[PDB]
Amino acid sequence: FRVQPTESIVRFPNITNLCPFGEVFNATRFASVYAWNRKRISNCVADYSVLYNSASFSTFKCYGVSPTKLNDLCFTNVYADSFVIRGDEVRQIAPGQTGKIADYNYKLPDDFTGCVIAWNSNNLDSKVGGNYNYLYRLFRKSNLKPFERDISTEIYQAGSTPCNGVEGFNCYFPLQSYGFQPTNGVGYQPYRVVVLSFELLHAPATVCGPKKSTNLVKNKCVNFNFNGLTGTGVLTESNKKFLPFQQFGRDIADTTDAVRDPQTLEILDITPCSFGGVSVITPGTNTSNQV
Amino acid sequence: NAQALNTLVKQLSSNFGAISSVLNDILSRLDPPEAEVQIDRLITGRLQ
């Protein structure tokens, strides 16, 4: 005997401050791979609709959430890594994809979760000015770990000889700039990419689109949704003091039991609504049909 | 018997390979053709 939920409570964060996404893709100068930037987007609504309007991305892949669900979802911390690479390196930015040269510069965590974005920078980064200010490390005595950037530039002791300051045969300079060309072939155009690390750890969600905050209701099991927590149970205040940190709770069966609301700082107690079991006590149908 | 039942519950808190352990946090992340494989993992595990 399963009681279906009545309505669909939704409770997303309060404000509707647009997230500064126009200065992520559409920006002037993108630092090279040997030193990329960290863009911490914090406590804002991010309407991905314009990120569906602004649709000029050549390659778009993510390994965590799906873009179908990116709209009706939330995140707690977001970080973006904007830079530029070769035309043949746009396929190298993928978790576990061992780069012939793309591990020295930028590696992706195999545990990644978030959508990477790439689009052709031929009209902005390939000009007559040579644009040799785009650089990338070519070799190093060790391969980097995913979210670490070796912005250092030292001499390389190739051939096992101390080439202290001098660049000679097998003493090369690692930070070799990009051999870009204004309006070169397809394989060699400068590609402008940007990743997004959606930290989906269960913490108070900040960066997500707006959805209709419906008023709380007690003792009525409803198809609620707290930042993706699509639970369908009754609601009540919880006696036990929740944590001043994250808004989510757990139990032995990893099915949330008590939460705290995004907007109001009131404690909630979740419980799947009345569940029992029918048992059709029947005499033989050859004798009746009443059960 | 009580301990058998008590160890049957704690199998709901097992990833079994999937990127979560609860079926509301797989359909709130992935899409049908891509969440179906995760749920296939979880369901063959829980059925086992």
Binding site: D251, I252, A253, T255, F275 | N6, V9
Partner: peptide, 30 residues
Amino acid sequence: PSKPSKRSFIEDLLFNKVTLDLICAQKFNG
């Protein structure tokens, strides 16, 4: 006959040393 259930003196010394929330979790998970 003192008890409502017609147990005995020695049956009572038994129904106390076994004793047979968690049951709510099991009830909710089916």
